[PDB]
Design a protein around this ligand. Structure first.
Ligand SMILES: *[C@@H]1O[C@H](CO)[C@@H](O[C@@H]2O[C@H](CO)[C@@H](O[C@@H]3O[C@H](CO)[C@@H](O)[C@H](O[C@H]4O[C@H](CO)[C@@H](O)[C@H](O)[C@@H]4O[C@H]4O[C@H](CO)[C@@H](O)[C@H](O)[C@@H]4O)[C@@H]3O)[C@H](O)[C@H]2NC(C)=O)[C@H](O)[C@H]1NC(C)=O
Ligand SMILES: *[C@@H]1O[C@H](CO)[C@@H](O[C@@H]2O[C@H](CO)[C@@H](O[C@@H]3O[C@H](CO)[C@@H](O)[C@H](O[C@H]4O[C@H](CO)[C@@H](O)[C@H](O)[C@@H]4O)[C@@H]3O)[C@H](O)[C@H]2NC(C)=O)[C@H](O)[C@H]1NC(C)=O
Ligand SMILES: *[C@@H]1O[C@H](CO)[C@@H](O[C@@H]2O[C@H](CO)[C@@H](O[C@@H]3O[C@H](CO)[C@@H](O)[C@H](O)[C@@H]3O)[C@H](O)[C@H]2NC(C)=O)[C@H](O)[C@H]1NC(C)=O
Ligand SMILES: C[C@@H](n1c(=O)[nH]c2ccc(C3=NC(=O)[C@](C)(c4ccccc4)N3)cc21)C(C)(C)C
Ligand SMILES: C[C@@H](n1c(=O)[nH]c2ccc(C3=NC(=O)[C@](C)(c4ccccc4)N3)cc21)C(C)(C)C
Ligand SMILES: C[C@@H](n1c(=O)[nH]c2ccc(C3=NC(=O)[C@](C)(c4ccccc4)N3)cc21)C(C)(C)C
Ligand SMILES: *[C@@H]1O[C@H](CO)[C@@H](O[C@@H]2O[C@H](CO)[C@@H](O)[C@H](O)[C@H]2NC(C)=O)[C@H](O)[C@H]1NC(C)=O
Ligand SMILES: *[C@@H]1O[C@H](CO)[C@@H](O)[C@H](O)[C@H]1NC(C)=O
Ligand SMILES: [Mn+2]
Ligand SMILES: [Mn+2]
Ligand SMILES: [Mn+2]
Lengths: 324, 329, 325
């Protein structure tokens, strides 16, 4: 009865009109979806062009994985977030080579076109791309409900341009990440748990928010029932082996407005469950402990932090072992 | 969990551009790891043991060839499966419905498909008579593999290879058993009534949907659960099917991506499914005999394409009566 | 007793090997004997007088020709009957369903609208249109309703000499909308045998001449007696290029008839063939309620009739009709 659930099981019995590169507006949804013309315009645009995901790469760094990476940092960002990206470049997103355990960094961007009243910062983006060589940008509209598109297109770039990275971190450009804690965690892993790695702040048996004022509002007419297990809150860590299997399976899952929920549907179709790890505190530390750098040593991700805070915490963290 | 299903999905991952990050085609030594992973292997019948141990070998060569069989482009290539000692079945087909012709644009050619019946399996050495029969009629194709029941999908793959290298321009292909009567006249009339689009992906026969593997150990099509699990794809079986040369060239290309299966007609269905096509049922394919009440009326043979099964004498008799059934019926 | 039947039976005896024991094709003086052997000649309408007086003439020349229009072997020859002042009709077809693209060619079939019949001189305009689109065929005869069967014959001649290789031929009016997409799907859905003797359209059986003097298809009894053969009329029909030459060769054996579509039926009947009815040929229109719904068009092949702007409109409402039907 809900549109996405109705169309997903239709897609499923196919694998037991194209849904991948039919890029004209499907207008059948206007009469099929109850109350279409009253929904917010993001639902309208999401349902009209759900069946198009063959968008091209505008800005690429094809040599980013010329040397085999051990951990690929892939940070979701928007065009005007220059300070966020530069803070990450200087703090936890530094590229390293501490023993051929190469850590590489890319930012994942869509477009902020002039027709959506975005200011033209494209000439500034290219200068940033030339100088830091860490920008990947595709020609889709970088909107909130196009973030699963951002997920799939990044998975495609890994299959073509970085298929041999050992591990992959994917997060938001406003989360602080303890990369030192992540590296030692990865190094401490058996090669059977490393193969199917997917950890984060996992939530089980969650349903869609129906309050039309909240961020993740999904009406019953669009989706029905409960969400599969999914890591959320702005960061999860998984294997490059799982990343390749993930991208292959995206063909059999329709896009979903919530990107972290879409990634849980792909893991489920693969017969896996994301593993909860307490180190992903997508809800912040208590204000009492924010002044104690030692409250950061044993976590892996804390949301959210401003560009100044990320540089400050990273600087204090470098000499934290002498105080904790 | 079954062995064939497990190995075929391994092959799907090998050919998938994303998921792919010894040969299954020319590894002709015994594949001994099947003795460990196939539960109850050494208790399986001999044909199952030999099928699993050499499943990865299909690069067999022609010992007898008719390389100029399709010099003139044929409208209908008749490809009849046969065994070496079936001299009477083949000769009866030559004199009856398997006659070659050049009737005004519509050329019909004929080949018999043979494997080996070697002396080490106690077969009588009939190679001299076979070479004599080949030189006389020039319609025998023979490959250097053991012609057993569980190697018929090998006979299927090797014939498609021969079509792609020696008869690619044939408009249509009929493949059948050497004991089925085929109304070639009715088949030609049906082929000529086809729209240009229906003739490109033509594949008709006696098709069965949602069929499963026979689990009785004593029947002819027995397949245990250690070998195959689940249901069969749709496939035409029971004596013969009809399809286009365009389809045959597509079929041979896809054969590399499908592991051999002990039932040849099932294997062809697996290839069709992988190609995205579905074989179409045609009621003229009587893989069971005609009703006993009508098995004597020559009328019953004007309106079918194929009937199973007829002895060599019966084929000649029915065909002779067909040459005048237009006035009687 | 009737004139055309009596004269047709004379032709049938002359063309029979056995029964054979002025011309009827290039006698272009007034056949004055019809004034006495046709009872009531003086009181017939003027179109019947001119038809009876020059029935035995048909060696008219090509004033404007596109000689290499079929230099590339066409899959479909679009032949449209049109009158010289119909510039809007022809250009609307050129931009819509008559687009020359399985290569498709297009020709418009015209006679002469001479000044002696009080026609405005549009010759300079026609030559400009012909020089710019290269799709005008015009013969030196009076383009009259009762001369349309003569239009059929001269076009069939032109096919046999200037475009004999065409696979299929469509012949229609310049005011009918034709779904070029749909009809091409029908043509590719044909076996060769059926594609060799194809002749489809709105076929009528056991039709007769209308005898009411004030109707358009009025034919008096002194001209034609009996019923009509099966014939396809009402806007257009589709047939094979092989059938076209079989049609031209035997037009010599059939006297011209005032009703062009009936004449083609007589030509087919003398060939031993029967035209095949096809419900996709809606010579009558479609129900007003089902109009505006573009799906009522992508199912049919021919609809009569539409104005120039409508043809351009429906053709563009068609290129997006698969989204909904
Ligand atoms: C995810 O990203 C994809 C790809 O970027 C997005 O899909 C694109 O979506 C846009 C809509 O935002 C769509 O644009 C429409 O194409 C239609 C084709 O007919 C047009 O109807 C429509 O034209 C409107 O916008 C034009 C430019 O603004 C105007 O020139 C035109 O007059 C129309 O104007 C309407 O909207 C403007 C708003 O500015 C308004 O001022 C006007 O009054 C009028 O109401 C669009 O051009 C693209 O076709 C899609 N691209 C592809 C490749 O498919 C998708 O929207 C994103 N998903 C989410 C959930 O955001
Ligand atoms: C389908 O056809 C293929 C090819 O014809 C066929 O594979 C062949 O199978 C036979 C077994 O029937 C293999 O022959 C054996 O190889 C092993 C190891 O080399 C030997 O142990 C066997 O020798 C035995 O038989 C000898 C008698 O000749 C005795 O001297 C000895 O004591 C043993 O009993 C035998 O040489 C052969 O290697 C393959 N050939 C190829 C090219 O792969 C397959 O069996 C057929 N499948 C079915 C299902 O029938
Ligand atoms: C069909 O087309 C033919 C060819 O145009 C028409 O024949 C033409 O008919 C006109 C009569 O309208 C003839 O003009 C006349 O000749 C007579 C005697 O010479 C004269 O008295 C008239 O003043 C006029 O000049 C013309 O000769 C004739 N053309 C030829 C070459 O035959 C015919 O009329 C048309 N038929 C119909 C049914 O409209
Ligand atoms: C999440 C990453 N992100 C991205 O990569 N593209 C985004 C596009 C939109 C947003 C986005 N979040 C919102 O609260 C807001 C304002 C929104 C508007 C309307 C309804 C719901 C939500 N819009 C975030 C994007 C980020 C922020 C880390 C870069
Ligand atoms: C079918 C065509 N055929 C062929 O071309 N090679 C064949 C090899 C074996 C057989 C074959 N059928 C059987 O019932 C039997 C006895 C069998 C033995 C063991 C298990 C199951 C079945 N063996 C048939 C072959 C034919 C007969 C028309 C030529
Ligand atoms: C039909 C095609 N047509 C053609 O090609 N030449 C024509 C010459 C005359 C006519 C024509 N229609 C008539 O109803 C009319 C006025 C007539 C008057 C008196 C009695 C009977 C008929 N005369 C049509 C011609 C057309 C129009 C699609 C191009
Ligand atoms: C198919 O090809 C394979 C390899 O291309 C052949 O395997 C060889 O078999 C010969 C037989 O004497 C051995 O000497 C070689 O050592 C084998 N090579 C390999 C690479 O395995 C096989 O013979 C062919 N199958 C046939 C011809 O039936
Ligand atoms: C995707 O492919 C389709 C058809 O191949 C094409 O129409 C479309 O332009 C492509 N998508 C984009 C966003 O260009
Ligand atoms: Mn956030
Ligand atoms: Mn049999
Ligand atoms: Mn009209």
């Amino acid at each position: 009865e809900a549109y996405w659930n109705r169309e997903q099981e239709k897609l499923n019995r196919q694998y037991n009109i194209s849904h991948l590169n039919y890029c004209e507006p499907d207008l059948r949804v206007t009469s099929v979806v109850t109350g279409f013309n009253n929904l917010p315009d993001r639902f309208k645009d999401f349902l009209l062009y759900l069946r198009c995901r063959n968008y091209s790469l505008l800005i690429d760094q094809p040599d980013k994985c010329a040397k085999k990476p051990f951990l690929l940092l892939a940070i979701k960002s928007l065009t005007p977030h220059f300070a966020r990206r530069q803070a990450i470049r200087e703090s936890w997103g530094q590229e390293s080579n501490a023993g051929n355990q190469t850590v590489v960094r890319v930012f994942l961007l869509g477009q902020t076109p002039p027709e959506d009243n975005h200011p033209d910062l494209s000439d500034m983006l290219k200068f940033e791309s030339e100088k830091h060589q860490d920008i990947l940008m595709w020609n889709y509209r970088d909107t909130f409900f196009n973030l699963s598109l951002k997920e799939v297109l990044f998975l495609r770039w890994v299959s073509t341009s970085c298929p041999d990275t050992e591990f992959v971190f994917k997060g938001d450009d406003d989360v602080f990440v303890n990369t030192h804690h992540i590296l030692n965690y990865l190094n401490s892993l058996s090669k059977t748990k490393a193969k199917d790695l997917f950890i984060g702040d996992v939530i089980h048996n969650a349903g869609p928010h129906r309050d039309k004022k909240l961020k993740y509002y999904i009406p019953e007419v669009v989706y029905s029932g409960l969400y599969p297990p999914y890591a959320g809150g702005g960061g999860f860590l998984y294997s490059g082996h799982l990343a390749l299997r993930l991208y292959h399976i995206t063909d059999q899952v329709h896009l979903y407005p919530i990107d972290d929920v879409y990634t849980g549907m792909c893991l489920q179709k693969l017969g896996l469950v994301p593993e909860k790890h307490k180190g992903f505190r997508t809800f912040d530390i208590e204000e009492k402990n924010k002044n104690n750098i030692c409250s950061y040593v044993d976590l892996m991700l804390v949301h959210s932090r401003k560009p100044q805070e990320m540089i400050d915490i990273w600087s204090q963290l470098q000499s934290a072992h002498l105080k904790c």
